[PDB]
Design a binder for this molecule. Structure first.
Ligand SMILES: *[C@@H]1O[C@H](CO)[C@@H](O[C@@H]2O[C@H](CO)[C@@H](O)[C@H](O)[C@H]2NC(C)=O)[C@H](O)[C@H]1NC(C)=O
Ligand SMILES: *[C@@H]1O[C@H](CO)[C@@H](O[C@@H]2O[C@H](CO)[C@@H](O)[C@H](O)[C@H]2NC(C)=O)[C@H](O)[C@H]1NC(C)=O
Ligand code: NAG
Ligand code: NAG
Lengths: 21, 21
């Protein structure tokens, strides 16, 4: 729906702390 | 860089939710 939206990664800070746990 | 900064612990709430799993 958003006119002009762009693709980028969004960093989830939880994911690596689960990955290291 | 901060004039007058003080040392204290900062509680991360996710760390114990991992540690208690
Ligand atoms: C942003 O990402 C989406 C998803 O990868 C891209 O959408 C695809 O575009 C191609 C054509 O270039 C289509 O054949 C695919 O079917 C599309 N995927 C989906 C899920 O619809 C989109 O093109 C990307 N935007 C830019 C500017 O690169
Ligand atoms: C806040 O903590 C830092 C350490 O994290 C203290 O810095 C040390 O200070 C001593 C002298 O008191 C130096 O010999 C060390 O080299 C310092 N450590 C580092 C890593 O630079 C700092 O003094 C503390 N602040 C207060 C007001 O106690
Ligand atoms: C800016 O203009 C281009 C065409 O010149 C258009 O394809 C694009 O969607 C527009 N971007 C935004 C953010 O409106
Ligand atoms: C207040 O003054 C003391 C010295 O009297 C100094 O060490 C400290 O950095 C100062 N704190 C601030 C917030 O300016």
């Amino acid at each position: 729906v958003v006119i002009g939206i762009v693709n980028n990664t969004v960093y989830d800070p939880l994911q690596p702390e689960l990955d290291s746990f």
